[PDB]
Design a protein around this ligand. Structure first.
Ligand SMILES: [Mg+2]
Ligand SMILES: [Mg+2]
Ligand SMILES: [Mg+2]
Ligand SMILES: [Mg+2]
Ligand SMILES: [Mg+2]
Ligand SMILES: [Mg+2]
Ligand SMILES: [Mg+2]
Ligand SMILES: [Mg+2]
Ligand SMILES: [Mg+2]
Ligand SMILES: [Mg+2]
Ligand SMILES: [Mg+2]
Ligand SMILES: [Mg+2]
Ligand SMILES: [Mg+2]
Ligand SMILES: [Mg+2]
Ligand SMILES: [Mg+2]
Ligand SMILES: [Mg+2]
Ligand SMILES: [Mg+2]
Ligand SMILES: [Mg+2]
Ligand SMILES: [Mg+2]
Ligand SMILES: [Mg+2]
Ligand SMILES: [Mg+2]
Ligand SMILES: [Mg+2]
Ligand SMILES: [Mg+2]
Ligand SMILES: [Mg+2]
Ligand SMILES: [Mg+2]
Ligand SMILES: [Mg+2]
Ligand SMILES: [Mg+2]
Ligand SMILES: [Mg+2]
Ligand SMILES: [Mg+2]
Ligand SMILES: [Mg+2]
Ligand SMILES: [Mg+2]
Ligand SMILES: [Mg+2]
Ligand SMILES: [Zn+2]
Lengths: 111, 57, 71
RNA sequence: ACCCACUCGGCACCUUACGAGAAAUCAAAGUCUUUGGGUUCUGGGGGGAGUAUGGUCGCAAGGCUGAAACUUAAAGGAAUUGACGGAAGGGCACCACCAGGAGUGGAGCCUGCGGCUUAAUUUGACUCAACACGGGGAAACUCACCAGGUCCAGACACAAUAAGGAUUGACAGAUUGAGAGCUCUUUCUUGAUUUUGUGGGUGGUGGUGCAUGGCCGUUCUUAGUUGGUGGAGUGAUUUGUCUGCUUAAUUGCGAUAACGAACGAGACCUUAACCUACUAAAUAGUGGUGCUAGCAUUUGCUGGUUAUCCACUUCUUAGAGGGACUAUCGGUUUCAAGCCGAUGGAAGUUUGAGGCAAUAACAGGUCUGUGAUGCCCUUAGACGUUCUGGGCCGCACGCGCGCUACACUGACGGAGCCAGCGAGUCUAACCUUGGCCGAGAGGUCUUGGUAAUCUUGUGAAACUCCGUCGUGCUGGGGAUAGAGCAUUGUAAUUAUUGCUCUUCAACGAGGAAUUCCUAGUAAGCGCAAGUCAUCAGCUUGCGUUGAUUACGUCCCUGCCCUUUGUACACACC
């Protein structure tokens, strides 16, 4: 259960994602229901960027015991958007100033 | 899974992703009985396959 | 639930009686064939089908029901 | 007697820790694997058991000395995180109160639940989080219930049967609710498609939501969760993540062995507001001109004319931009975050209203949404499926959401006459203007619309206006009930709905209790959509008329927060 999930989180991550998330719910060799999360990286959960940047899909894997639920969540690097807001609305980047050379008495040039 | 064997999980999962990354990169550069069944009934539509005669009394 | 009320006398389906089929092809004297059980005249029944004989009855079975001929 | 300095010997306390400890802590519990100052005593896993036995002391009660067999994988200690408490300290909220508003609780009916009744009255759900909920407004269908009738749509594999016929069908009659060949009488037909048996499948609103997915509801009208470097602990862990202040908010300020960060809050997104600024529009509208009718005349006032032309974009429409950032100023406060007042502004309550919403929990609900599914039951006299009829509406009563009222801020009759969100017909009968016929309901003839184009300006309802009535269960109220006419539908009986006349009940503002709510909100008021053949007293949205009272607090209640206790961790079920 972990090897298969943990590997998928690695292939998604290795493929340039900002974050991933895998949920397995159901019953697996025991009689009682359990559920694990496998999530590495960065993922937002609220607001419009959800519609923009995270991809959700659930699948029902039907096994001889019962039926598990696979849920996957992939968060794409917004910098590569290529048709979008290129970042999260939180991103407030300041440009850095440049060192100036002071006083230098007036000395106007000509052309 | 028990956390007592978790190391052997993250390694065999990574090794899986290693194989999934090789199959993904090797598949990036890798290496007629016509007879017209719909018309074979119109081709073999020749005669000598019937019989019809009736109406006595 | 409330298993098994069932007022008695179950029902049987059918038999389709054995009836070693037509000997009703009357010959006279070697070897004329005089053909008992007159046939039907419906164009879908090419005279190979015959007519049953009940009272006031000459029924064509090949017609699943049709064309009640009366003689 | 008191003060100051010292010194012995006291009972203690404070800070440190070199040092010690499993830690809690300890100037001894320190000067121990770098293991030795003298000496006394006890203990060797937990029960059994301080029991049995003997000895001895005692008046007694009992004291001292004191086993074993057997049983058992733990018992135990200190600390950490949780979860819980009928402990303490703090907070937050009209699903809490305060100040009130409008009420429900009384009544008639509508509706749902229990109960009873029944051939059946299918069933899920029971504090907030069951009870106008399952989009659950069921005449058939639906449909799961009950009384009965058909059908296999029982794959496939082997075997049996069998071309001298494996099997199929049916006229009429009987029969049956039935023009079901269901079954039987009769006897034609059918041709290897079936039948029979076993194995194996299949269907099922059968069971299990305490086997599951998925989904949803609840905690949550909440504010919580985590990692990098550093500080503490042998360690699980901890500090960060905090007394206070501030906020709707772990929202910030500030204090600070922490520094700086991310998920969640915020940002964001949709909607309602502002543009005489940009781009435009015969499916949106304005002015002018023709053409045109009426009343005035002295030039005027009020209409007609999907294209007779010219121009424009204020109103309408939706594209791109703009705008707000709690701005300016002044109060208040650690002059910090903020907060209150005034000016301005379309807008200054997170601008108003939503959408999205981390980690975790629940044996919450849903196998009756699913050809989502484990297992179990059933599977041909069926728990499959279809057909006929009945039932889910059954009525001594208990409960919940509602509807309509008890009237004169009113009914009634004329008259004025104003919205907004929607929806509407192809292989079809959806939204419907208009003209007639009809008291009405409706009927009939046509027509526009696949829609900013036609219905529709949806001329909606309260409301405004002039009369009639006069406080009398009255002309308030419209339950109940009789007779008649229409519409939906194959069917209306237990009366689908609509109209008409008649019948004219209870109810005189409602006990104890209890819901909801702070501005275009409450309440009053209708309308569109969902459902829908017909049926809204329901819901989801919309606009119309438009208040009173708060702008506070922790008393009630509900929940968060620390503090604290724990022998709980399957965590007070
Ligand atoms: Mg948000
Ligand atoms: Mg110490
Ligand atoms: Mg707080
Ligand atoms: Mg308040
Ligand atoms: Mg009050
Ligand atoms: Mg009251
Ligand atoms: Mg049938
Ligand atoms: Mg079989
Ligand atoms: Mg069997
Ligand atoms: Mg099913
Ligand atoms: Mg459950
Ligand atoms: Mg569930
Ligand atoms: Mg149950
Ligand atoms: Mg509130
Ligand atoms: Mg804390
Ligand atoms: Mg965020
Ligand atoms: Mg404009
Ligand atoms: Mg002002
Ligand atoms: Mg339960
Ligand atoms: Mg389900
Ligand atoms: Mg039926
Ligand atoms: Mg019902
Ligand atoms: Mg309700
Ligand atoms: Mg009136
Ligand atoms: Mg008439
Ligand atoms: Mg037309
Ligand atoms: Mg009246
Ligand atoms: Mg009266
Ligand atoms: Mg009152
Ligand atoms: Mg309707
Ligand atoms: Mg309903
Ligand atoms: Mg504790
Ligand atoms: Zn015939």
């Amino acid at each position: 259960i972990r090897r298969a999930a943990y590997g998928v989180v690695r292939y998604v991550m290795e493929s340039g994602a900002k974050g991933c998330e895998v949920v397995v719910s159901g019953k697996l060799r025991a009689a009682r229901a359990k559920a694990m999360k496998f999530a590495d990286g960065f993922l937002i959960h609220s607001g419009q960027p959800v519609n923009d940047f995270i991809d959700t899909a659930t699948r029902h894997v039907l096994m001889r015991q019962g039926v598990l639920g696979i849920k996957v969540k992939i968060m794409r690097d917004p910098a590569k958007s290529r048709t979008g807001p290129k970042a999260l609305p939180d991103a407030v980047t300041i440009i850095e100033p440049k060192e100036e050379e002071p006083i230098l008495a007036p000395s106007v040039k000509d052309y | 899974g028990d956390d007592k064997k978790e190391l052997s999980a993250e390694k065999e999962a990574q090794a899986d992703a290693a194989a999934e990354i090789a199959e993904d990169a090797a598949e990036a550069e890798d290496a007629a009985k016509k007879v017209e069944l719909d018309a074979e009934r119109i081709e073999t539509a020749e005669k000598e396959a019937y019989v019809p005669a009736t109406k006595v009394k | 639930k409330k298993v098994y009320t069932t007022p008695k006398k179950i029902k049987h389906k059918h038999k389709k009686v054995k009836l070693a089929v037509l000997s009703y092809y009357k010959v006279d004297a070697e070897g004329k064939v005089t053909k008992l059980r007159r046939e039907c005249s419906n164009p879908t029944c090419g005279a190979g089908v015959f007519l049953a004989n009940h009272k006031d009855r000459l029924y064509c079975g090949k017609c699943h029901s049709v064309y009640k001929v009366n003689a």
